[PDB]
Amino acid sequence: HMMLAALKEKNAALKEKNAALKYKLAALKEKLGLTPELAALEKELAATEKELAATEWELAALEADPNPDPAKLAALEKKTAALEKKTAALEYKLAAL
């Protein structure tokens, strides 16, 4: 439960970051036009968003489980860390524009 509570908080921060990146992306599209780089970053943001939605389903099932599988919890933890790195990389690509 302790490790699952932290994963829920990390997921919450990731959804908030993804939303703000959406508004930054759209703002950059206005300032610079639809450049091929922005189109690539939008495609990467849309993908990352879909993986974030999928892992929230895993959080919910693990929360409902009276004895949550440590293996599934560890799989979610590594997936959350990968998405945190992917989102931070996308944030840097956007800030560089």
Numbering used by the authors: -1 to 95
What do the study's own words say?
Here we describe the combination of rational and computational design to deliver three-helix bundle (3HB) peptide assemblies and single-chain proteins with control over topology and thermal stability. Next, AlphaFold2 models for both designs are used to seed computational designs of single-chain proteins where the helices are connected by loop building. Synthetic genes for these express in E. coli to yield soluble, monomeric, and thermally stable proteins.
For this section, this parent design with a single polar layer of Asn@a, Thr@d, and Thr@d (N-T-T) in the B, A, and N helices is referred to as sc-apCC3-CW-1NTT. As hydrophobic core packing is a key stabilising force in water-soluble globular proteins, we investigated whether introducing additional polar layers could attenuate core stability without compromising the overall 3HB structure. All sequences were evaluated using AF2, which consistently predicted clockwise 3HB topologies with high confidence. CD spectra showed a progressive decrease in helicity with the addition of N-T-T layers. Variable-temperature CD measurements revealed that sc-apCC3-CW with 0, 1, and 2 N-T-T layers were hyperthermally stable and did not unfold upon heating. By introducing polar residues into the hydrophobic core, we fine-tune thermal stability without compromising folding specificity.
